[PDB]
Amino acid sequence: KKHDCGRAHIQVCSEEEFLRDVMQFLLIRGHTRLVPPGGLAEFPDAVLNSKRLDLFNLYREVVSRGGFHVGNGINWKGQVFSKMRNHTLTNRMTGVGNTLKRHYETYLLEYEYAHDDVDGECCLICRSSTAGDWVNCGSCGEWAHFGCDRRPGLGAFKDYAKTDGLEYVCPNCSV
Amino acid sequence: ARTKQT
DNA sequence: TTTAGATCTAAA
DNA sequence: TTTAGATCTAAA
Ligand SMILES: [Zn+2]
Ligand SMILES: [Zn+2]
Ligand SMILES: [Zn+2]
Protein backbone atom coordinates (compact mmCIF):
# COMPACT_ATOMS: atom_id res chain seq x y z
CA LYS A 1 0.00 0.00 0.00
CA LYS A 2 2.77 2.52 0.93
CA HIS A 3 6.08 3.40 -0.73
CA ASP A 4 8.94 2.65 1.60
CA CYS A 5 11.40 5.31 0.44
CA GLY A 6 11.74 7.11 3.81
CA ARG A 7 11.24 10.45 2.02
CA ALA A 8 11.14 13.51 4.27
CA HIS A 9 7.74 14.62 5.62
CA ILE A 10 5.96 16.90 3.18
CA GLN A 11 6.24 20.00 5.42
CA VAL A 12 10.04 19.98 5.24
CA CYS A 13 10.76 17.99 2.03
CA SER A 14 12.79 19.73 -0.68
CA GLU A 15 11.65 19.85 -4.24
CA GLU A 16 14.58 17.76 -5.44
CA GLU A 17 14.05 15.01 -2.85
CA PHE A 18 10.33 14.95 -3.70
CA LEU A 19 10.80 14.78 -7.46
CA ARG A 20 13.42 12.03 -7.21
CA ASP A 21 11.03 10.03 -5.05
CA VAL A 22 8.22 10.55 -7.61
CA MET A 23 10.50 9.34 -10.43
CA GLN A 24 11.50 6.23 -8.45
CA PHE A 25 7.85 5.48 -7.63
CA LEU A 26 6.69 5.88 -11.23
CA LEU A 27 9.41 3.43 -12.35
CA ILE A 28 8.55 0.83 -9.73
CA ARG A 29 4.89 1.08 -10.84
CA GLY A 30 5.92 0.43 -14.42
CA HIS A 31 5.09 3.82 -15.93
CA THR A 32 8.42 4.03 -17.75
CA ARG A 33 7.11 6.45 -20.41
CA LEU A 34 6.64 9.13 -17.72
CA VAL A 35 10.36 9.25 -16.79
CA PRO A 36 12.42 10.51 -19.76
CA PRO A 37 16.14 9.87 -20.17
CA GLY A 38 18.41 12.55 -18.71
CA GLY A 39 17.39 12.22 -15.10
CA LEU A 40 15.80 14.79 -12.87
CA ALA A 41 16.68 17.75 -15.13
CA GLU A 42 14.33 16.40 -17.84
CA PHE A 43 11.40 15.33 -15.55
CA PRO A 44 8.54 15.70 -16.25
CA ASP A 45 8.22 16.01 -20.03
CA ALA A 46 5.10 18.14 -19.75
CA VAL A 47 4.60 21.84 -20.30
CA LEU A 48 1.97 24.18 -18.82
CA ASN A 49 1.75 27.86 -19.82
CA SER A 50 5.16 27.55 -21.60
CA LYS A 51 7.06 26.29 -18.54
CA ARG A 52 7.86 22.73 -17.41
CA LEU A 53 5.00 21.40 -15.26
CA ASP A 54 5.63 22.17 -11.52
CA LEU A 55 4.64 18.87 -9.89
CA PHE A 56 5.95 19.80 -6.44
CA ASN A 57 3.64 22.73 -5.89
CA LEU A 58 0.73 20.97 -7.65
CA TYR A 59 1.14 18.08 -5.17
CA ARG A 60 1.54 20.29 -2.06
CA GLU A 61 -1.53 22.36 -2.85
CA VAL A 62 -3.75 19.32 -3.44
CA VAL A 63 -2.69 17.15 -0.52
CA SER A 64 -2.93 20.15 1.91
CA ARG A 65 -6.63 20.31 0.95
CA GLY A 66 -7.40 16.65 1.51
CA GLY A 67 -6.17 15.02 -1.70
CA PHE A 68 -7.47 14.47 -5.22
CA HIS A 69 -10.77 13.01 -4.07
CA VAL A 70 -11.88 16.46 -2.94
CA GLY A 71 -12.28 17.08 -6.65
CA ASN A 72 -13.93 20.33 -7.58
CA GLY A 73 -14.00 21.16 -3.86
CA ILE A 74 -10.46 22.41 -4.68
CA ASN A 75 -10.24 25.66 -6.67
CA TRP A 76 -7.75 24.42 -9.25
CA LYS A 77 -7.40 27.57 -11.36
CA GLY A 78 -7.62 29.99 -8.46
CA GLN A 79 -5.78 28.32 -5.57
CA VAL A 80 -3.62 25.52 -7.05
CA PHE A 81 -2.41 27.07 -10.31
CA SER A 82 -1.67 30.38 -8.55
CA LYS A 83 1.03 28.68 -6.42
CA MET A 84 2.75 26.92 -9.31
CA ARG A 85 5.73 28.20 -11.26
CA ASN A 86 3.50 27.86 -14.34
CA HIS A 87 1.30 30.75 -13.25
CA THR A 88 1.55 34.13 -14.93
CA LEU A 89 -0.43 37.24 -13.90
CA THR A 90 -1.95 37.62 -17.32
CA ASN A 91 -2.62 34.24 -18.84
CA ARG A 92 -5.38 32.74 -20.94
CA MET A 93 -5.24 29.27 -19.33
CA THR A 94 -8.98 28.89 -19.41
CA GLY A 95 -8.96 25.12 -19.21
CA VAL A 96 -6.28 24.93 -16.61
CA GLY A 97 -8.31 23.26 -13.89
CA ASN A 98 -9.16 20.35 -16.14
CA THR A 99 -5.55 20.20 -17.37
CA LEU A 100 -4.18 20.14 -13.82
CA LYS A 101 -6.57 17.36 -12.80
CA ARG A 102 -5.40 15.28 -15.81
CA HIS A 103 -1.74 15.87 -14.95
CA TYR A 104 -2.40 14.98 -11.32
CA GLU A 105 -4.01 11.73 -12.44
CA THR A 106 -1.00 10.94 -14.69
CA TYR A 107 1.87 11.77 -12.34
CA LEU A 108 0.64 12.05 -8.77
CA LEU A 109 -2.55 10.15 -7.90
CA GLU A 110 -1.02 6.72 -7.30
CA TYR A 111 1.85 8.47 -5.53
CA GLU A 112 -0.61 10.25 -3.24
CA TYR A 113 -2.25 6.94 -2.27
CA ALA A 114 1.18 5.39 -1.52
CA HIS A 115 2.31 8.20 0.81
CA ASP A 116 1.02 9.86 4.00
CA ASP A 117 1.00 13.46 2.96
CA VAL A 118 -2.73 14.27 2.91
CA ASP A 119 -4.10 16.77 5.50
CA GLY A 120 -6.78 15.30 7.70
CA GLU A 121 -7.00 18.05 10.36
CA CYS A 122 -10.22 18.58 12.26
CA CYS A 123 -12.09 21.88 12.59
CA LEU A 124 -10.39 24.14 15.13
CA ILE A 125 -13.84 25.18 16.41
CA CYS A 126 -15.93 21.99 16.64
CA ARG A 127 -13.07 19.44 16.58
CA SER A 128 -14.73 17.20 13.97
CA SER A 129 -14.03 16.41 10.29
CA THR A 130 -17.62 16.81 9.04
CA ALA A 131 -18.13 17.37 5.32
CA GLY A 132 -18.67 20.96 4.26
CA ASP A 133 -16.99 24.24 3.40
CA TRP A 134 -13.70 25.05 5.13
CA VAL A 135 -11.41 28.05 5.39
CA ASN A 136 -7.74 28.02 6.49
CA CYS A 137 -6.73 30.60 9.09
CA GLY A 138 -4.15 32.99 7.70
CA SER A 139 -2.70 33.52 11.19
CA CYS A 140 -2.33 30.06 12.78
CA GLY A 141 -2.74 27.87 9.66
CA GLU A 142 -5.41 25.65 11.23
CA TRP A 143 -8.65 24.82 9.47
CA ALA A 144 -12.23 25.76 10.34
CA HIS A 145 -15.61 24.96 8.93
CA PHE A 146 -17.02 28.18 7.55
CA GLY A 147 -20.32 27.21 9.20
CA CYS A 148 -18.73 26.98 12.65
CA ASP A 149 -17.73 30.65 12.61
CA ARG A 150 -20.83 32.62 13.65
CA ARG A 151 -19.22 36.05 13.89
CA PRO A 152 -21.09 38.86 12.11
CA GLY A 153 -19.40 40.60 9.20
CA LEU A 154 -17.80 37.55 7.58
CA GLY A 155 -17.94 37.48 3.83
CA ALA A 156 -19.76 34.88 1.73
CA PHE A 157 -17.81 31.67 1.39
CA LYS A 158 -17.39 32.23 -2.34
CA ASP A 159 -15.50 35.45 -1.60
CA TYR A 160 -12.93 33.51 0.44
CA ALA A 161 -12.69 30.74 -2.13
CA LYS A 162 -12.26 32.82 -5.30
CA THR A 163 -8.72 33.54 -6.46
CA ASP A 164 -6.94 36.08 -4.22
CA GLY A 165 -10.01 36.18 -2.05
CA LEU A 166 -10.75 37.61 1.39
CA GLU A 167 -8.29 37.18 4.26
CA TYR A 168 -9.60 34.77 6.92
CA VAL A 169 -8.49 34.95 10.58
CA CYS A 170 -10.11 32.44 12.93
CA PRO A 171 -11.96 33.34 16.16
CA ASN A 172 -9.13 32.02 18.36
CA CYS A 173 -6.48 34.21 16.63
CA SER A 174 -8.51 37.38 16.24
CA VAL A 175 -7.59 40.43 18.26
CA ALA B 1 -8.18 32.58 1.73
CA ARG B 2 -7.02 29.03 1.33
CA THR B 3 -10.19 26.92 1.24
CA LYS B 4 -11.59 23.49 0.53
CA GLN B 5 -15.06 21.95 0.16
CA THR B 6 -15.35 18.31 1.28
C1' DT C 1 -0.24 13.76 -29.32
C1' DT C 2 0.14 17.80 -26.62
C1' DT C 3 -0.92 22.50 -25.56
C1' DA C 4 -3.21 27.38 -25.49
C1' DG C 5 -7.18 29.73 -25.89
C1' DA C 6 -12.42 30.14 -27.03
C1' DT C 7 -16.67 28.96 -25.56
C1' DC C 8 -19.65 25.96 -23.62
C1' DT C 9 -22.01 24.61 -18.77
C1' DA C 10 -22.52 24.47 -13.53
C1' DA C 11 -22.79 26.69 -9.41
C1' DA C 12 -23.56 30.25 -6.25
C1' DT D 1 -24.19 38.66 -12.05
C1' DT D 2 -19.13 36.28 -11.18
C1' DT D 3 -16.04 32.41 -11.04
C1' DA D 4 -14.24 28.15 -12.56
C1' DG D 5 -14.55 23.19 -14.75
C1' DA D 6 -15.39 20.78 -19.31
C1' DT D 7 -15.10 20.55 -24.11
C1' DC D 8 -13.66 21.81 -28.49
C1' DT D 9 -10.46 24.13 -32.03
C1' DA D 10 -6.24 24.86 -34.09
C1' DA D 11 -1.55 24.85 -33.90
C1' DA D 12 2.57 22.51 -33.04
ZN1 LIG E 1 8.11 7.57 -1.54
ZN1 LIG F 1 -16.51 22.82 12.68
ZN1 LIG G 1 -6.17 31.05 13.74
Side-chain angles (χ1 to χ4, degrees):
Chain A
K1 182 70 181 295
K2 301 296 168 176
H3 199 208
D4 255 19
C5 78
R7 198 214 66 211
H9 293 205
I10 198 60
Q11 298 95 332
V12 292
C13 186
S14 70
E15 178 172 353
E16 168 144 355
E17 183 174 346
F18 173 81
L19 290 172
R20 291 189 182 275
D21 197 56
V22 175
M23 295 171 65
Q24 184 202 308
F25 177 81
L26 290 174
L27 291 180
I28 208 50
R29 291 296 301 260
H31 308 309
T32 58
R33 75 169 199 97
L34 301 184
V35 183
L40 167 72
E42 310 283 348
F43 175 79
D45 188 12
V47 174
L48 180 66
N49 197 23
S50 302
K51 293 181 174 178
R52 187 177 314 269
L53 178 68
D54 177 5
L55 291 168
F56 185 51
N57 285 302
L58 168 59
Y59 185 74
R60 291 195 301 176
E61 292 309 319
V62 169
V63 299
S64 70
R65 292 175 171 85
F68 188 72
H69 180 65
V70 174
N72 288 334
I74 289 164
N75 182 352
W76 292 85
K77 181 158 181 68
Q79 287 180 44
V80 177
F81 182 54
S82 62
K83 298 300 287 298
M84 299 173 63
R85 291 191 287 268
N86 308 87
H87 176 80
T88 55
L89 185 107
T90 65
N91 72 78
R92 289 309 296 159
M93 296 292 306
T94 49
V96 77
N98 186 266
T99 296
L100 288 177
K101 289 166 80 181
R102 287 195 304 93
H103 287 313
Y104 195 100
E105 285 176 338
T106 300
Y107 289 100
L108 295 173
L109 184 56
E110 295 179 349
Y111 186 95
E112 179 198 305
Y113 297 156
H115 291 79
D116 297 303
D117 304 321
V118 172
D119 191 290
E121 294 177 51
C122 69
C123 176
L124 62 91
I125 298 164
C126 74
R127 319 301 315 191
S128 92
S129 288
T130 317
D133 297 337
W134 306 69
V135 184
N136 184 250
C137 180
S139 171
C140 67
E142 293 177 358
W143 286 94
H145 294 112
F146 191 69
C148 284
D149 188 341
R150 297 290 288 183
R151 290 176 299 168
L154 288 180
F157 176 75
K158 70 177 171 195
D159 287 324
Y160 294 92
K162 67 187 183 186
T163 190
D164 199 14
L166 295 174
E167 174 191 22
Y168 177 73
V169 173
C170 82
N172 295 348
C173 285
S174 283
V175 299
Chain B
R2 298 169 52 85
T3 66
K4 62 187 180 180
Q5 302 177 274
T6 60

Short mmCIF file of all heavy atoms in Angstrom, two decimals, chain A residues 92-140:
data_model
loop_
_atom_site.label_atom_id
_atom_site.label_comp_id
_atom_site.label_asym_id
_atom_site.label_seq_id
_atom_site.Cartn_x
_atom_site.Cartn_y
_atom_site.Cartn_z
N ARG A 92 -4.09 33.17 -20.40
CA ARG A 92 -5.38 32.74 -20.94
C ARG A 92 -5.56 31.21 -20.79
O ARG A 92 -5.96 30.52 -21.74
CB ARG A 92 -5.52 33.13 -22.41
CG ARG A 92 -5.69 34.64 -22.66
CD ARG A 92 -6.81 35.22 -21.80
NE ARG A 92 -8.13 34.68 -22.13
CZ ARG A 92 -9.19 34.69 -21.31
NH1 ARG A 92 -9.09 35.22 -20.10
NH2 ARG A 92 -10.35 34.18 -21.71
N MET A 93 -5.20 30.70 -19.62
CA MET A 93 -5.24 29.27 -19.33
C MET A 93 -6.62 28.89 -18.85
O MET A 93 -6.83 28.54 -17.68
CB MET A 93 -4.19 28.93 -18.28
CG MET A 93 -2.74 29.18 -18.79
SD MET A 93 -2.21 28.07 -20.11
CE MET A 93 -2.51 26.48 -19.38
N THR A 94 -7.59 29.04 -19.74
CA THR A 94 -8.98 28.89 -19.41
C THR A 94 -9.39 27.47 -19.08
O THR A 94 -10.41 27.24 -18.40
CB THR A 94 -9.84 29.36 -20.55
OG1 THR A 94 -9.34 28.74 -21.71
CG2 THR A 94 -9.73 30.88 -20.70
N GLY A 95 -8.62 26.50 -19.53
CA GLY A 95 -8.96 25.12 -19.21
C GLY A 95 -7.98 24.52 -18.21
O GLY A 95 -7.81 23.30 -18.13
N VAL A 96 -7.38 25.39 -17.40
CA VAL A 96 -6.28 24.93 -16.61
C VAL A 96 -6.70 24.00 -15.49
O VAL A 96 -5.97 23.09 -15.14
CB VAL A 96 -5.44 26.11 -16.06
CG1 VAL A 96 -6.14 26.80 -14.86
CG2 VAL A 96 -4.04 25.60 -15.66
N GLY A 97 -7.90 24.20 -14.91
CA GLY A 97 -8.31 23.26 -13.89
C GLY A 97 -8.42 21.84 -14.41
O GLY A 97 -7.91 20.90 -13.81
N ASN A 98 -9.06 21.69 -15.56
CA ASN A 98 -9.16 20.35 -16.14
C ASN A 98 -7.75 19.77 -16.48
O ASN A 98 -7.48 18.58 -16.25
CB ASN A 98 -10.02 20.42 -17.42
CG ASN A 98 -10.28 19.05 -18.01
OD1 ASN A 98 -9.54 18.63 -18.90
ND2 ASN A 98 -11.33 18.37 -17.57
N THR A 99 -6.90 20.62 -17.05
CA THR A 99 -5.55 20.20 -17.37
C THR A 99 -4.78 19.74 -16.13
O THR A 99 -4.12 18.68 -16.13
CB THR A 99 -4.82 21.34 -18.07
OG1 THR A 99 -5.48 21.60 -19.32
CG2 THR A 99 -3.40 20.91 -18.38
N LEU A 100 -4.90 20.51 -15.03
CA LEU A 100 -4.18 20.14 -13.82
C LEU A 100 -4.71 18.83 -13.23
O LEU A 100 -3.93 18.02 -12.71
CB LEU A 100 -4.28 21.25 -12.76
CG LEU A 100 -3.46 22.48 -13.07
CD1 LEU A 100 -3.71 23.52 -12.01
CD2 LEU A 100 -1.96 22.15 -13.09
N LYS A 101 -6.03 18.62 -13.28
CA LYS A 101 -6.57 17.36 -12.80
C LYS A 101 -6.05 16.18 -13.62
O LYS A 101 -5.70 15.16 -13.04
CB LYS A 101 -8.12 17.41 -12.82
CG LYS A 101 -8.62 18.35 -11.72
CD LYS A 101 -10.11 18.69 -11.93
CE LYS A 101 -10.91 17.57 -11.43
NZ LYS A 101 -12.41 17.85 -11.63
N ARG A 102 -5.93 16.34 -14.96
CA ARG A 102 -5.40 15.28 -15.81
C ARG A 102 -3.92 15.02 -15.49
O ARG A 102 -3.48 13.87 -15.39
CB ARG A 102 -5.60 15.65 -17.27
CG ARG A 102 -7.03 15.58 -17.77
CD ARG A 102 -7.14 15.62 -19.31
NE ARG A 102 -6.49 16.79 -19.90
CZ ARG A 102 -5.23 16.81 -20.33
NH1 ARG A 102 -4.47 15.73 -20.21
NH2 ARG A 102 -4.71 17.91 -20.85
N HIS A 103 -3.15 16.08 -15.27
CA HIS A 103 -1.74 15.87 -14.95
C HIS A 103 -1.60 15.22 -13.58
O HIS A 103 -0.67 14.43 -13.36
CB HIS A 103 -0.96 17.18 -14.93
CG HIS A 103 -0.71 17.80 -16.28
ND1 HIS A 103 -0.23 17.07 -17.35
CD2 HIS A 103 -0.78 19.09 -16.70
CE1 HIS A 103 -0.05 17.89 -18.38
NE2 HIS A 103 -0.37 19.11 -18.01
N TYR A 104 -2.51 15.58 -12.63
CA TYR A 104 -2.40 14.98 -11.32
C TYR A 104 -2.69 13.49 -11.44
O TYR A 104 -1.96 12.65 -10.87
CB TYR A 104 -3.38 15.64 -10.35
CG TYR A 104 -3.09 15.33 -8.90
CD1 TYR A 104 -2.41 16.23 -8.11
CD2 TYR A 104 -3.50 14.12 -8.30
CE1 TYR A 104 -2.16 15.96 -6.80
CE2 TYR A 104 -3.24 13.84 -6.97
CZ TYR A 104 -2.57 14.77 -6.24
OH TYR A 104 -2.28 14.53 -4.91
N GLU A 105 -3.74 13.14 -12.17
CA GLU A 105 -4.01 11.73 -12.44
C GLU A 105 -2.83 10.99 -13.06
O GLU A 105 -2.52 9.85 -12.67
CB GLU A 105 -5.21 11.60 -13.37
CG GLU A 105 -6.49 11.89 -12.62
CD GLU A 105 -7.72 11.88 -13.50
OE1 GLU A 105 -7.59 12.06 -14.74
OE2 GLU A 105 -8.83 11.69 -12.96
N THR A 106 -2.14 11.59 -14.02
CA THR A 106 -1.00 10.94 -14.69
C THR A 106 0.19 10.74 -13.74
O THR A 106 0.77 9.64 -13.68
CB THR A 106 -0.59 11.83 -15.89
OG1 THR A 106 -1.71 11.92 -16.78
CG2 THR A 106 0.65 11.26 -16.66
N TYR A 107 0.60 11.81 -13.03
CA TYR A 107 1.87 11.77 -12.34
C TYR A 107 1.78 11.50 -10.86
O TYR A 107 2.74 10.99 -10.24
CB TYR A 107 2.63 13.10 -12.53
CG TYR A 107 3.14 13.32 -13.92
CD1 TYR A 107 2.45 14.13 -14.83
CD2 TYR A 107 4.34 12.71 -14.33
CE1 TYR A 107 2.94 14.34 -16.13
CE2 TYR A 107 4.82 12.89 -15.61
CZ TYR A 107 4.13 13.69 -16.51
OH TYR A 107 4.64 13.90 -17.78
N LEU A 108 0.63 11.89 -10.23
CA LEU A 108 0.64 12.05 -8.77
C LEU A 108 -0.43 11.26 -8.02
O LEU A 108 -0.28 11.08 -6.80
CB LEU A 108 0.49 13.55 -8.42
CG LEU A 108 1.65 14.45 -8.86
CD1 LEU A 108 1.28 15.96 -8.61
CD2 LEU A 108 2.87 14.03 -8.07
N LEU A 109 -1.46 10.74 -8.68
CA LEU A 109 -2.55 10.15 -7.90
C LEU A 109 -2.15 8.85 -7.19
O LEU A 109 -2.38 8.67 -5.97
CB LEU A 109 -3.73 9.93 -8.81
CG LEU A 109 -4.93 9.41 -8.07
CD1 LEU A 109 -5.37 10.30 -6.90
CD2 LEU A 109 -6.05 9.33 -9.10
N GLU A 110 -1.51 7.93 -7.93
CA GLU A 110 -1.02 6.72 -7.30
C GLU A 110 0.02 7.04 -6.23
O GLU A 110 0.04 6.44 -5.17
CB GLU A 110 -0.40 5.79 -8.35
CG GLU A 110 -1.48 5.32 -9.31
CD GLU A 110 -0.97 4.39 -10.41
OE1 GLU A 110 0.28 4.25 -10.58
OE2 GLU A 110 -1.84 3.79 -11.07
N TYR A 111 0.86 8.01 -6.54
CA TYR A 111 1.85 8.47 -5.53
C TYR A 111 1.18 8.95 -4.26
O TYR A 111 1.59 8.59 -3.16
CB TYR A 111 2.73 9.56 -6.12
CG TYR A 111 3.88 10.00 -5.21
CD1 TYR A 111 5.14 9.44 -5.36
CD2 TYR A 111 3.68 11.01 -4.24
CE1 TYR A 111 6.20 9.83 -4.54
CE2 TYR A 111 4.68 11.39 -3.41
CZ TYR A 111 5.95 10.79 -3.58
OH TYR A 111 6.97 11.18 -2.74
N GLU A 112 0.12 9.74 -4.42
CA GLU A 112 -0.61 10.25 -3.24
C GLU A 112 -1.11 9.08 -2.37
O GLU A 112 -0.93 9.09 -1.15
CB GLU A 112 -1.80 11.10 -3.67
CG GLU A 112 -2.62 11.63 -2.45
CD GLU A 112 -4.04 12.11 -2.88
OE1 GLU A 112 -4.17 12.98 -3.78
OE2 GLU A 112 -5.04 11.61 -2.33
N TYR A 113 -1.73 8.08 -3.03
CA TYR A 113 -2.25 6.94 -2.27
C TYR A 113 -1.12 6.17 -1.53
O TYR A 113 -1.33 5.59 -0.47
CB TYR A 113 -2.99 5.98 -3.18
CG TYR A 113 -4.24 6.51 -3.89
CD1 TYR A 113 -4.67 5.92 -5.08
CD2 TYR A 113 -4.93 7.63 -3.43
CE1 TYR A 113 -5.79 6.37 -5.75
CE2 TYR A 113 -6.09 8.08 -4.11
CZ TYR A 113 -6.50 7.45 -5.28
OH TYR A 113 -7.61 7.84 -6.02
N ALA A 114 0.07 6.14 -2.14
CA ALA A 114 1.18 5.39 -1.52
C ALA A 114 1.99 6.17 -0.49
O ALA A 114 3.00 5.67 0.01
CB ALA A 114 2.12 4.87 -2.59
N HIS A 115 1.59 7.40 -0.19
CA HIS A 115 2.31 8.20 0.81
C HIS A 115 1.34 8.71 1.87
O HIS A 115 0.15 8.39 1.81
CB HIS A 115 3.08 9.33 0.14
CG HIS A 115 4.22 8.83 -0.66
ND1 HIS A 115 4.06 8.29 -1.93
CD2 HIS A 115 5.54 8.68 -0.35
CE1 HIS A 115 5.23 7.85 -2.37
NE2 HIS A 115 6.14 8.07 -1.43
N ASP A 116 1.86 9.42 2.87
CA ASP A 116 1.02 9.86 4.00
C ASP A 116 1.09 11.35 4.13
O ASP A 116 1.33 11.89 5.22
CB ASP A 116 1.46 9.17 5.28
CG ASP A 116 1.28 7.67 5.20
OD1 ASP A 116 0.14 7.21 4.94
OD2 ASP A 116 2.30 6.96 5.36
N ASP A 117 0.84 12.03 3.03
CA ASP A 117 1.00 13.46 2.96
C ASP A 117 -0.30 14.25 3.02
O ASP A 117 -0.26 15.49 3.03
CB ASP A 117 1.72 13.82 1.68
CG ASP A 117 3.05 13.11 1.54
OD1 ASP A 117 3.76 12.98 2.56
OD2 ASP A 117 3.39 12.75 0.42
N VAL A 118 -1.44 13.56 3.00
CA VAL A 118 -2.73 14.27 2.91
C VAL A 118 -3.21 14.81 4.25
O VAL A 118 -3.17 14.07 5.24
CB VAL A 118 -3.82 13.35 2.31
CG1 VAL A 118 -5.20 14.00 2.38
CG2 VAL A 118 -3.42 13.03 0.86
N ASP A 119 -3.60 16.10 4.28
CA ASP A 119 -4.10 16.77 5.50
C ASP A 119 -5.45 16.26 5.93
O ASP A 119 -6.39 16.17 5.10
CB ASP A 119 -4.17 18.27 5.25
CG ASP A 119 -4.41 19.05 6.54
OD1 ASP A 119 -5.52 18.96 7.11
OD2 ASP A 119 -3.47 19.76 6.98
N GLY A 120 -5.52 15.80 7.17
CA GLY A 120 -6.78 15.30 7.70
C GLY A 120 -7.12 15.99 9.02
O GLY A 120 -7.76 15.38 9.89
N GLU A 121 -6.73 17.25 9.14
CA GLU A 121 -7.00 18.05 10.36
C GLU A 121 -8.48 18.21 10.60
O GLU A 121 -9.27 18.28 9.66
CB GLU A 121 -6.39 19.44 10.23
CG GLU A 121 -4.89 19.52 10.18
CD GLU A 121 -4.46 20.95 9.98
OE1 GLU A 121 -4.93 21.83 10.75
OE2 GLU A 121 -3.70 21.21 9.03
N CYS A 122 -8.84 18.30 11.88
CA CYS A 122 -10.22 18.58 12.26
C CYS A 122 -10.44 20.09 12.32
O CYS A 122 -9.51 20.88 12.26
CB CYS A 122 -10.55 17.94 13.61
SG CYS A 122 -9.71 18.70 15.03
N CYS A 123 -11.70 20.47 12.41
CA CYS A 123 -12.09 21.88 12.59
C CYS A 123 -11.61 22.41 13.93
O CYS A 123 -11.84 21.79 14.96
CB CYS A 123 -13.64 21.98 12.50
SG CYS A 123 -14.28 23.63 12.81
N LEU A 124 -10.97 23.57 13.91
CA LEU A 124 -10.39 24.14 15.13
C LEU A 124 -11.49 24.56 16.07
O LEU A 124 -11.23 24.71 17.28
CB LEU A 124 -9.47 25.34 14.79
CG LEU A 124 -10.10 26.56 14.10
CD1 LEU A 124 -10.58 27.61 15.10
CD2 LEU A 124 -9.12 27.22 13.12
N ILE A 125 -12.69 24.80 15.53
CA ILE A 125 -13.84 25.18 16.41
C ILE A 125 -14.55 23.99 16.99
O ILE A 125 -14.61 23.85 18.22
CB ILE A 125 -14.85 26.05 15.63
CG1 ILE A 125 -14.15 27.35 15.20
CG2 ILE A 125 -16.06 26.39 16.52
CD1 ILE A 125 -14.87 28.14 14.10
N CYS A 126 -15.11 23.12 16.15
CA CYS A 126 -15.93 21.99 16.64
C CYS A 126 -15.21 20.67 16.85
O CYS A 126 -15.80 19.73 17.36
CB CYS A 126 -17.10 21.74 15.71
SG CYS A 126 -16.64 20.92 14.13
N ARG A 127 -13.98 20.57 16.36
CA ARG A 127 -13.07 19.44 16.58
C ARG A 127 -13.51 18.18 15.83
O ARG A 127 -13.08 17.08 16.17
CB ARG A 127 -12.91 19.14 18.08
CG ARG A 127 -12.79 20.35 19.01
CD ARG A 127 -11.62 21.28 18.70
NE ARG A 127 -10.37 20.56 18.46
CZ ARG A 127 -9.17 21.13 18.37
NH1 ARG A 127 -9.04 22.45 18.54
NH2 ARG A 127 -8.10 20.38 18.13
N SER A 128 -14.33 18.34 14.80
CA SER A 128 -14.73 17.20 13.97
C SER A 128 -14.28 17.40 12.52
O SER A 128 -13.83 18.50 12.15
CB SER A 128 -16.25 17.03 14.01
OG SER A 128 -16.86 17.75 12.95
N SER A 129 -14.43 16.36 11.70
CA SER A 129 -14.03 16.41 10.29
C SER A 129 -15.20 16.41 9.32
O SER A 129 -15.03 16.02 8.15
CB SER A 129 -13.12 15.24 9.96
OG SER A 129 -11.85 15.42 10.55
N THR A 130 -16.37 16.81 9.81
CA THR A 130 -17.62 16.81 9.04
C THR A 130 -17.48 17.42 7.66
O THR A 130 -16.74 18.40 7.47
CB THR A 130 -18.74 17.57 9.81
OG1 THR A 130 -18.70 17.20 11.19
CG2 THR A 130 -20.12 17.27 9.24
N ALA A 131 -18.19 16.87 6.68
CA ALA A 131 -18.13 17.37 5.32
C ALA A 131 -18.72 18.77 5.23
O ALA A 131 -19.66 19.11 5.97
CB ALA A 131 -18.88 16.42 4.39
N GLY A 132 -18.15 19.62 4.37
CA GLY A 132 -18.67 20.96 4.26
C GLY A 132 -17.62 21.91 3.72
O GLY A 132 -16.60 21.49 3.20
N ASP A 133 -17.92 23.21 3.83
CA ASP A 133 -16.99 24.24 3.40
C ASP A 133 -16.02 24.60 4.49
O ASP A 133 -16.45 24.86 5.60
CB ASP A 133 -17.74 25.50 2.97
CG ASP A 133 -18.66 25.27 1.77
OD1 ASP A 133 -18.44 24.32 0.97
OD2 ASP A 133 -19.58 26.10 1.60
N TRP A 134 -14.73 24.69 4.17
CA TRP A 134 -13.70 25.05 5.13
C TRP A 134 -12.88 26.23 4.68
O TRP A 134 -12.60 26.40 3.48
CB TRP A 134 -12.71 23.91 5.31
CG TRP A 134 -13.21 22.53 5.67
CD1 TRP A 134 -13.94 21.66 4.88
CD2 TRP A 134 -12.91 21.82 6.89
NE1 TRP A 134 -14.11 20.47 5.55
CE2 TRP A 134 -13.48 20.54 6.78
CE3 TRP A 134 -12.15 22.15 8.02
CZ2 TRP A 134 -13.35 19.58 7.79
CZ3 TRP A 134 -12.03 21.21 9.04
CH2 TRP A 134 -12.62 19.93 8.91
N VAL A 135 -12.39 27.01 5.64
CA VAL A 135 -11.41 28.05 5.39
C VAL A 135 -10.18 27.83 6.28
O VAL A 135 -10.28 27.35 7.42
CB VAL A 135 -11.99 29.47 5.57
CG1 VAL A 135 -10.96 30.47 5.19
CG2 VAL A 135 -13.15 29.71 4.68
N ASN A 136 -8.99 28.18 5.75
CA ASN A 136 -7.74 28.02 6.49
C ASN A 136 -7.40 29.38 7.14
O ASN A 136 -7.43 30.43 6.47
CB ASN A 136 -6.62 27.58 5.57
CG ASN A 136 -5.32 27.32 6.33
OD1 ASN A 136 -4.35 28.07 6.20
ND2 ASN A 136 -5.29 26.28 7.10
N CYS A 137 -7.11 29.35 8.43
CA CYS A 137 -6.73 30.60 9.09
C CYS A 137 -5.40 31.11 8.61
O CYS A 137 -4.41 30.42 8.73
CB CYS A 137 -6.71 30.35 10.58
SG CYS A 137 -6.22 31.87 11.54
N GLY A 138 -5.39 32.37 8.17
CA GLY A 138 -4.15 32.99 7.70
C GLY A 138 -3.15 33.24 8.84
O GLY A 138 -1.96 33.46 8.58
N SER A 139 -3.59 33.21 10.08
CA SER A 139 -2.70 33.52 11.19
C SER A 139 -2.05 32.25 11.78
O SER A 139 -0.82 32.16 11.91
CB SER A 139 -3.52 34.25 12.24
OG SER A 139 -2.80 34.40 13.44
N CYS A 140 -2.85 31.25 12.13
CA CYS A 140 -2.33 30.06 12.78
C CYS A 140 -2.18 28.86 11.84
O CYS A 140 -1.57 27.88 12.24
CB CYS A 140 -3.21 29.64 13.98
SG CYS A 140 -4.88 29.06 13.59
#
